[PDB]
């Protein structure tokens, strides 16, 4: 099916929102599909949101160019199957995420175990069956599991104090009271979604396995997390090439507890909605050496901040060992690094900060050919897509007005 | 009452907050730890106190840990902050906090039956619950009929250009039509997808302080019983013929959505005098307000928006207009009973709302606030955490408007 | 001789900057009279200065369709003459102030039968005309009479600042009364109010001789010129306040000139008045009747007078703030519509919440006023630079980051 | 006579300006010396700008004391002598540097047995001796033999900017051939250029004498007051590269002080001077020598020349770019601490980003400086505003306040 989506504002005028809802309805689309509101920059205008598939595609055409010039609007063609003259597709609404989650062996550590396998497709349908606003279903982990859990667990921890960066060490004891972060215990889903919740509005989304680099991380333009349920087979507790429980809960979500590193990673994510395939990889490769493996300075000394690194005990160890080679972050080099899965990581990135990495990231973004820009509008749960004057002028006003506050404030 | 107060880490400073409770036989669940967002060594502390023995917990937060702590009563004890809610589930709290012989409906069986059920609703309403729905009687529904059709027809010359800019798409997404009353949990969807507004069913009348409060969290009280069908004209009591057509349009509206907010913030921990002075600003513009469009002048208060008689005299001659200046507003003496004799006139909401945070600024309290969207929180700010908070989200919205003027 | 003006800007190419200055060549146009620079945010672009005047005008349409059609330069035509869909002509640079500094708006006058008086009168005026931007400006030796004369305005005046002016100009007063001479026995030499306001805010000043237009006028304000007169009211009235003379320019004046949030604000109604419509200059002129000329300000628990022509008159300064004058507060839209008249005291003044707000109020009032552009002052060239392109937001953009780049590294 | 300066702000309070005015005139301080101005931020202070000499200096401490004690008034105490708790004299207004405009710095230069040419550096010296803030800089007709080098020099390097130099010089250079007479033929006289420098970044030259002191000169450039030489080097040699003549002032400077960003980084160099002790002098000279003076910057995937001493050295020019040099990228901790050699070619060269990127790395250099206070330059009463913590938040903050309004009514046009 895919997924069409038509981006466009229309000033109100008497008859235009009149019109332009025939217009979808002389081409026979329902009206169930477009959706009004009003521009949430633009006081006279109204913006469209369309929820189409390729099934409307005979009509799409004919409409975008009486939309263009019959009223002169400014329309971008949203497409799933990225083809010719079209802006990859994204969702615009958080809940406009269901509509790929889903969308997802013979040397695995647990191919022959039956269990293990039986298992897996329990957390799988709890995560198939997943949509937004739902609590994440609370499974009882087997005492199996809850080793497994331990055995990673124990060994971590103690290479913390030392190895993992401040802001990791600084949430880490709050998920331990709060969140049932212990030795002995394997924290829940949605205890820790609402955790995230109240730090940072990072949520979590159970999700059955490994989603394309584009969705996982349009996910992170919603502050919305793509997490597994399961845990790695208990056979070797150390396996690491697929991202088990382990990687989530003590990998990603201490530092998505943090509002920089939370910004930052938001901004990777802000990036890819609507970014050329090339640069949906160019994202996955910075993602790679800065959420994935990234160190990061704290004063005089390097740390680590990756969640491949917080959640490998193997690698958390080595790459503060002087045999790794580094490399201060730089994306228009950074992009372009090759990395392999599989082997401890030769050559890491090092950053001087969560927010100077933010920054960074917003700059390359600027070299990310869309014909728009984007801003999440963290009060409607919708991605605000920016390619007016008239809407800069809105936003610059909207500056303004809290530099006031902060001259104010001076005196 | 509760206590607010950061926190550095310095000598195990988290965990000596903790065994300060323990010793103290106070469960950790009512201690809310949460790491700073401005100051990355730093925890923020929120607890919801067991009056007893409260003096040896801050006299030894305040010394023994060194931190700063903020007690908030809403008992009103001198030397004290009023209490507000932090978080939007906060507003659970003092919801039910409400207020009749001389009713149009008081020897109607059934009127006086559907109230008591309308209330019981708002009673049992949580946050983050849906909004029980209800069948309207037919009966109801002429009357809502009798009031929409009456009004619907003053709107496109009396009313203001934001109302009119969302008026036809509540008529068509949300069943506002005279033959049908929508039902608030929709309206409450639409409001979240325009501004991220929330309705809250309300038995009745709050004081303006809880009232104004929820406005800081973008949650407007909102009542779900009408008016009694032997008077359709009443409009005394708040109805929801006042809610859905004199506030959710307005509501719907970026700039007056902000502006009423503003409103709601400025009102958080504000001395007695001035939540009287913000809820007298409030009656003279979200609810009585009058704005100004190129040479003349449209109606945007609810009160004005949901009163056919008064919709009509508010922009006639025989009242008096004078501009909006808040510090002469929020010092004006109204009455609900009749016409109003004044209106306050306001250029724009944008203006509104930068009226109201200066006067906002004159209000005292030992911390400034700022609403979090994302974590659906308001957060204290001392007057250095401030200027941290602003220049840092300031360099955000300069980012995002170098990388789209390309 | 009137004014025209190309006002455009235009990317370097290989030969671009040589074919624009053929083009202007071509039609006798000296190479003084066009005069290119590097554009201050672009850094690939030229701006240009054509300092042209009536007898261009059979060749100018010719040269502005050949930068259009086949260099491919936005132009911006400027007129004096406000021809056939042109933009009110304006100084470009600080120097350029010289040009119509000289247009110039005695029966009843008090000083009409005193040949002395007259004749003081047209030396005043002489040095005006013979003025250039950049000259010292000519002291003059003034007599007892006219030293008396100030010092009667002066001493009835000094008496009442203290209970009666704003803060900013009591403020600044005892300064000028220290460091320009500002005494009761002693008419102040325009040259050391000029380098005093210099040292103040940027502010200096322009000898005039009598009346310029409002747009003329205003448009100084943007270079923070201020065109002063430099005699003195006859000594028969010396309450006579139907023209600016030296008294309403340093006592009204002056010491608000010295104030930087007041400064910047009269500049932005000079900032405002660049190419605006015949409409807006009344507009503008109307607000700064209000504001500049007859305001009032709220200070905290009181409200103050600042306007020049309260400051400088005695008898207007204590009915302002008595209950007899009605009260509004600033409003522009309806403030730039205000009717009065110059004959009595007002019956109506507009009360400013303060320097800082009536700047932002005019500011949102520029953005109303119909231009191509807008425009902001350099005071490092001392030029005006016209803002038309998204070229040049991206770039005041960035400027803007760095700065809260380093607001934020100077907090944390 | 040296210099004295007292740096120091007073909240208007009834009687406090008058008791200030008078322990320094009781102290024969008299008023001309002690200028009293609002202060900008704060709307109820006033700021003193002292102008003094070691003549005052018996009453120096007494004067402080009440000004601290009895006045309650944070005073700096600025000094040029630089004693131990004095910071190292500036100038505040751009006329100041009129005080020391002429502290300036033979037998083997190329020019000794010529009895014309040493005639002739008196007669540029006398001009540069006389010369005073605001005045006109006097017209100086050349000789034909003077033209002559200034040809051999300039006809070498045009023939070489387009592809050695960096955009800048480049954008700038065609304006200033056709507006200051930039030619072959014709060396341009300073007036004419320092009035093209005022209309392009607010740039103005100075005529000086000789080479002053670091700290003199760099101080200059935070005001955008380039001291400037008028003669030109002697004829036999035109090569010849130790002294800085006119080929060096106006090839290897004008075009870039043209120039925005690079006007902004080189005044970035001169407001990080202001105070600043001897050791951090020297390490601003050396930061100098590598960008200003001996720079290369970064220009898409190549590399050109910005510094005046290769763009004014046609030999130089073409080694800089060539595959001999050691190249490094500018870092300024390191840079500072550069070994350097003025006579040879310079065997390392540190490449700058871009201006913009260079002004930023200096900016945070300064940072680390020692200093008790801030400094920002004021172009419109063309004075160094000297702040403290909460003032620099203030004009910063309000910097941006009046930039974004503009940005926000541009918006809409």
Same mark, same amino acid.
């Given at each position: 099916?895919?997924?069409? /989506?038509? @981006?466009? #504002? &229309?000033?109100?005028?008497? %008859? !235009?929102?009149?019109?332009? =809802?025939?217009?979808?309805? +002389? ?29 409307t595609?005979?009509?799409?055409? /004919?409409? @975008?160019? #009486? &939309?263009?010039?019959?009223? %002169? !609007?400014?329309?971008?063609? =949203?497409?799933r199957?990225? +083809? ?14 269901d ?40 499974v +009882? ?23 993992a ?16 972060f ?37 996910g ?20 690491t ?28 994510g ?49 790459c ?40 960074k ?9 869309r ?9 409607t ?6 390619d ?21 404030a001076?005196?």
């Amino acid at each position: 099916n895919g997924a069409i /989506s038509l @981006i466009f #504002s &229309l000033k109100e005028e008497v %008859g !235009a929102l009149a019109k332009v =809802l025939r217009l979808f309805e +002389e081409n026979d689309i329902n009206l169930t599909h477009i959706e009004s509101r009003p521009s949430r920059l633009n006081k006279d205008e109204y913006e469209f949101f369309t929820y189409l598939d390729k099934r409307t595609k005979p009509v799409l055409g /004919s409409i @975008i160019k #009486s &939309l263009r010039n019959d009223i %002169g !609007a400014t329309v971008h063609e =949203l497409s799933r199957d990225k +083809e010719k003259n079209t802006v990859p597709w994204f969702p615009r609404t958080i809940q406009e995420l269901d509509r790929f989650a889903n969308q997802i062996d013979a040397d695995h550590p647990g191919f022959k175990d039956p269990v293990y396998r039986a298992r897996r497709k329990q957390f799988a349908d709890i995560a198939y069956n997943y949509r937004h606003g739902q609590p994440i279903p609370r499974v +009882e982990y087997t005492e199996e599991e809850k080793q497994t859990w331990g055995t990673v667990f124990r060994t971590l921890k103690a290479l913390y104090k030392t190895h993992a960066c401040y802001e990791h060490n600084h949430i880490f004891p709050l998920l331990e009271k709060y969140c049932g972060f212990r030795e002995d215990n394997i924290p829940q889903l949605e205890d820790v979604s609402q955790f995230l919740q109240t730090c940072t509005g990072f949520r979590l989304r159970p999700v059955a396995g490994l989603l394309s680099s584009r969705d996982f991380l349009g996910g992170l333009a919603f502050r919305v997390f793509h997490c597994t349920q399961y845990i790695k087979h208990g056979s070797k507790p150390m396996y690491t090439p697929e991202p088990d429980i382990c990687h989530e809960l003590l990998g990603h979500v201490p530092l998505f507890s943090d509002r920089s590193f939370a910004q930052f990673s938001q901004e990777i994510g802000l990036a890819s909605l609507g970014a050329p395939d090339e640069y949906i990889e160019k994202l996955a490769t910075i993602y790679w050496f800065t959420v994935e493996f990234g160190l990061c300075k704290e004063g005089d000394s390097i740390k680590a901040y990756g969640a491949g690194l917080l959640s490998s005990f193997g690698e958390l160890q080595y790459c503060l060992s002087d045999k790794p080679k580094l490399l201060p972050l730089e994306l228009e080099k950074t992009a372009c690094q090759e990395y392999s899965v599989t082997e401890f990581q030769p050559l890491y990135y090092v950053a001087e900060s969560f927010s100077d990495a933010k920054e960074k990231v917003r700059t390359f973004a600027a070299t990310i050919p869309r014909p728009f820009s984007v801003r999440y509008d963290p009060y409607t749960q919708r991605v605000e897509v920016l390619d007016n004057t008239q809407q800069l002028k809105i936003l610059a006003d909207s500056i303004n007005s809290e530099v006031g506050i902060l001259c104010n404030a001076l005196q």
